[PDB]
Amino acid sequence: DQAGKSPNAVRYHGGDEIILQGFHWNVVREAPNDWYNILRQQAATIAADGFSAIWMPVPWRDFSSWSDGSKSGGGEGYFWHDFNKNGRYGSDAQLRQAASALGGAGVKVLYDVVPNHMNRGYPDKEINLPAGQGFWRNDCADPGNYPNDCDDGDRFIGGDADLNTGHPQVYGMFRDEFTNLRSQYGAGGFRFDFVRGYAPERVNSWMTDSADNSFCVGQLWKGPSEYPNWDWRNTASWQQIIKDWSDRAKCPVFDFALKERMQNGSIADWKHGLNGNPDPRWREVAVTFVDNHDTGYSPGQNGGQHHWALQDGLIRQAYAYILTSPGTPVVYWDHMYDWGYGDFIRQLIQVRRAAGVRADSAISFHSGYSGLVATVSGSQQTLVVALNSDLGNPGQVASGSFSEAVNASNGQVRVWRS
Ligand SMILES: [Ca+2]
Ligand SMILES: [Ca+2]
């Protein structure tokens, strides 16, 4: 657990984390109020499985609800009303035991933080920010889902719940809460939600003031077509958009360029995500995932959100590639503990660890076979990865003595050098 910043000063924490997304969308529904006890009970497992960090759900209490026609939601944390740590996932006391047990087993706790907005109209809540005082986005003219004088980022839905995160007083509030999470809830890092809602520069602000040396990740989900026509990003690549954000916030960023290639291109096009980047400075800030709570399915209620879910026929291949490649991989809870991909994912974590693959290890792609075939230069071992390809032996693409590390789904997943 080497914990340092990247050459460009990005908060990647050594570049050797292996993160577990600690929850799915329907937990509040499936294990109402018992979520932190379940995690306290699994901390030992999570640690033994190889994770270095865990991404916790929003700690700020959410008692929102929404219906209209069979299909509901609420209380997951993205529409919180207070910094109180009560209900939905568990009590403040179970949170403390959860974090104390996780941290005690060597797993960092990363908190999901939601600064863009809050449940403004919730009755019984501890934070009350009046209108006309400049605390809210809507205190200014709001022409459209574009920055106004009261919010230097996009808005959430209508934008009636958007805070002016730039207001000294709204800024200091979040800053205090972050420090709080760190001194009393053992936070080891933060996962910023909806990063397009407020300046990236503010995220660096928050990290410098509260946990300068911790791990951070931002989720920027905004494609080129969502930027104005005159903006340079309207014609850039997904990777450029994502890297610019990282350059300014000084935090790694979820690799939405690889997610977009997993969803829209071929396995061969997977080399086009941030983590395939021939530049170490580019590749090393990527946070690769296969699915999260938004993009994927969740057990229970209506399959969850599944906004951009990867087909089950590519799950094994997706994990085999983020677990063996550069960037910092995230494993989805359900894949891991619900759906039975666990043993396969345990094998890969071991292989990543044994070859000493890290954020910045080099990777080269091999042109002449079908599927994706890559040579990943681990700091201890070289890996040869052949996904859905015709590659016959590792020696056809790399010099050296090789051993079968993984061999799954009728040869569709093959990884060599132990
Ligand atoms: Ca580390
Ligand atoms: Ca905003």
From Swiss-Prot:
**Which residues are annotated as site, described as Transition state stabilizer?**
294
Question: Which keywords belong to this entry?
Answer: Calcium, Carbohydrate metabolism, Disulfide bond, Glycosidase, Hydrolase, Metal-binding, Secreted, Signal
| Presence of keyword Calcium | yes
Q: What is this protein called?
A: Glucan 1,4-alpha-maltotetraohydrolase
Q: Which GO terms describe its molecular function?
A: alpha-amylase activity; glucan 1,4-alpha-maltotetraohydrolase activity; metal ion binding; starch binding
Q: Describe its partners and assembly state.
A: Monomer.
Which residues are Ca(2+) 1-binding?
1-2, 13, 16-17
Q: List the disulfide bonds.
A: 140-150, 216-251
Q: Which family does it belong to?
A: Belongs to the glycosyl hydrolase 13 family.
The UniProt record's further free-text remark is:
There are several isoenzyme forms of this protein.
Q: Which cofactor does it need?
A: Ca(2+)
Parent-protein residues present: 22 to 439 of 548
What organism does the record attribute this protein to? Stutzerimonas stutzeri
What is any one of the record's Gene Ontology cellular component terms?
extracellular region
Q: Does the record carry Protein biosynthesis as a key word?
A: no
Q: What is its main location?
A: secreted
Reactions that this protein is recorded to catalyse: Hydrolysis of (1->4)-alpha-D-glucosidic linkages in amylaceous polysaccharides, to remove successive maltotetraose residues from the non-reducing chain ends
